[PDB]
CSV table of C-alpha atoms in Angstrom, one decimal:
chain,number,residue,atom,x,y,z
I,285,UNK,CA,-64.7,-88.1,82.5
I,286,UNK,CA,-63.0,-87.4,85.8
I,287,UNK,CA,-63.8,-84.1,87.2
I,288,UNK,CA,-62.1,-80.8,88.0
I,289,UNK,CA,-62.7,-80.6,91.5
I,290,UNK,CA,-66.3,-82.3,91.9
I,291,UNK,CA,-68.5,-81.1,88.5
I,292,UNK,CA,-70.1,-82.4,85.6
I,293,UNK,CA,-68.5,-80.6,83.0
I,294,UNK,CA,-68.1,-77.3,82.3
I,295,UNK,CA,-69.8,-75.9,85.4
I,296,UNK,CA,-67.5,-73.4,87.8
I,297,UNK,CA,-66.5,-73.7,91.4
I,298,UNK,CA,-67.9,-70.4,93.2
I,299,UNK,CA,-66.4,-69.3,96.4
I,300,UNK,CA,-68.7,-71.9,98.2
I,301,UNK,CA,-67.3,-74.4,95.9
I,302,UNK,CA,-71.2,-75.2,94.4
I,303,UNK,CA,-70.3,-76.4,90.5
I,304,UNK,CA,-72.1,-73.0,88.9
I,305,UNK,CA,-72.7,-72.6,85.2
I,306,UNK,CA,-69.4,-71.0,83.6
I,307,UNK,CA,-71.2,-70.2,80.4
């Protein structure tokens, strides 16, 4: 499962770009 800019899955990229949760 590729990723969507450098997470695991589901996680968010903040404004820093560090994969935070999204739920």
């Amino acid at each position: 499962e590729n990723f969507n800019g450098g997470c695991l899955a589901g996680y968010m990229r903040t404004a820093d770009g560090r994969c935070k949760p999204t739920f």
